[PDB]
Amino acid sequence: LVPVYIYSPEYVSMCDSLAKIPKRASMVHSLIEAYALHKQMRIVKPKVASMEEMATFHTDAYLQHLQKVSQHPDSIEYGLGYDCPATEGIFDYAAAIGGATITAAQCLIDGMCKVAINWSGGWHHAKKDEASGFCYLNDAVLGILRLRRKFERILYVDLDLHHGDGVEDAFSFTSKVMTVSLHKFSPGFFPGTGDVSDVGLGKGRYYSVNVPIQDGIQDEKYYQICESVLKEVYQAFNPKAVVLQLGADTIAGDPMCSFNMTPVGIGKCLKYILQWQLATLILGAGGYNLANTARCWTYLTGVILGKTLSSEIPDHEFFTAYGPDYVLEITPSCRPDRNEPHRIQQILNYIKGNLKHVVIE
Numbered sequence: 362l363v364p365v366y367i368y369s370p371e372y373v374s375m376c377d378s379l380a381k382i383p384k385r386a387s388m389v390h391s392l393i394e395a396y397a398l399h400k401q402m403r404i405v406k407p408k409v410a411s412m413e414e415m416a417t418f419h420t421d422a423y424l425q426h427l428q429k430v431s432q433h434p435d436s437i438e439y440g441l442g443y444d445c446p447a448t449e450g451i452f453d454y455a456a457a458i459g460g461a462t463i464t465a466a467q468c469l470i471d472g473m474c475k476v477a478i479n480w481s482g483g484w485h486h487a488k489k490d491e492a493s494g495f496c497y498l499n500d501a502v503l504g505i506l507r508l509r510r511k512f513e514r515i516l517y518v519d520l521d522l523h524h525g526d527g528v529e530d531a532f533s534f535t536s537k538v539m540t541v542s543l544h545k546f547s548p549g550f551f552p553g554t555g556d557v558s559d560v561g562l563g564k565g566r567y568y569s570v571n572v573p574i575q576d577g578i579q580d581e582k583y584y585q586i587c588e589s590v591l592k593e594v595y596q597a598f599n600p601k602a603v604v605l606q607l608g609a610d611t612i613a614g615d616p617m618c619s620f621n622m623t624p625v626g627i628g629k630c631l632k633y634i635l636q637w638q639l640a641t642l643i644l645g646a647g648g649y650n651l652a653n654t655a656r657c658w659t660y661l662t663g664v665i666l667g668k669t670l671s672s673e674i675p676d677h678e679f680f681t682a683y684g685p686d687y688v689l690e691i692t693p694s695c696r697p698d699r700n701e702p703h704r705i706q707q708i709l710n711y712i713k714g715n716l717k718h719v720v721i722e
């Protein structure tokens with residue numbers, strides 16, 4: 362039907378308080394509203410996740426400590442400290458984002474929509490009892506566990522710059538959820554996991570697909586790799602629902618300065634997934650050039666709505682942040698692509714061999 366847009370003014374205000382991305386949620390929604398895209402979507406207010414719902418993946422012990430420090434020596438033991446500081450109210454922030462993704466997943470299984478959007482979600486590094494990489498709660502896993510009540514095989518596609526290790530670890534032992542992550546992979550780069558030989562464990566073996574990619578990849582080659590993998594994944598795995606993480610830290614201009622992507626390339630990967638006509642949960646999380654992240658997700662929202670957007674950024678609250686040209690398009694950086702053609706073919710062929718075992722159920 363009409364895409365569902367998870368939004369409430371209190372929810373965006375909560376997401377703006379994250380120290381790593383101040384006011385990014387307001388910038389994203391303000392630009393989407395500036396293009397009047399919210400009038401073409403069904404606005405759904407997100408609920409706050411309960412302790413029972415967060416406990417479907419996270420352990421009690423980790424959730425108790427998170428709730429205590431939210432209002433300590435054992436904080437480092439649960440991954441709280443450096444990348445994830447235990448600030449006041451951090452448990453309610455986690456429950457808010459986790460509940461937003463659960464809400465979007467609930468809309469999918471109720472037949473209310475075929476696409477549900479929660480751009481502020483997709484924190485894919487958190488483990489069942491350990492925070493990691495700015496992630497205290499793994500709302501992506503919680504969203505998958507909610508769709509799992511109705512859909513038998515769920516495909517998780519992680520297009521963030523970083524490896525989605527938390528989601529992959531959560532389902533590394535099952536064949537009922539397949540994780541596919543395209544990410545920068547280089548010794549020293551966070552989180553350091555997700556080589557192409559990472560395929561899963563036990564009965565989940567060959568149901569974890571990882572595409573290690575080097576710096577400087579652009580739209581054309583990226584869609585070549587993504588369409589090649591998604592085509593083989595769709596025919597070998599035959600999914601019934603898709604969870605799509607679209608972190609914008611791959612876009613040119615991001616301080617990560619690794620990939621050299623534009624939203625047009627990500628949108629072509631998104632169009633290929635929407636053509637499957639499946640229930641699709643859209644997440645974001647990643648993105649540290651605030652204006653470029655709003656640019657990307659606004660463009661991707663238009664791709665979902667099938668609309669073509671005006672190049673000029675309309676005047677709004679955060680208009681001054683869209684220099685230097687104040688247009689929606691993003692120009693790739695003039696730096697080399699470090700992806701050798703023979704290395705990419707070697708990675709794709711290795712994945713093709715792994716997926717042949719999936720065609721032998």
Ligand SMILES: CN(C)c1ccc(C(=O)NCCCCCCC(=O)NO)cc1
Pocket residue numbers: 444486494495521522523551608610646647648
């Ligand atoms: C300049 N400065 C203080 C820092 C710069 C980079 C990092 C970092 O990458 N840390 C490793 C954790 C990265 C997790 C990124 C989360 C993400 O986007 N996942 O997709 C840390 C501090």
Ligand SMILES: [K+]
Pocket residue numbers: 519520521522523524525542543544
């Ligand atoms: K990824």
Ligand SMILES: [K+]
Pocket residue numbers: 532533534535536537538539540561565568569
């Ligand atoms: K798996």
Ligand SMILES: [Zn+2]
Pocket residue numbers: 521522523608610647648
């Ligand atoms: Zn990232």
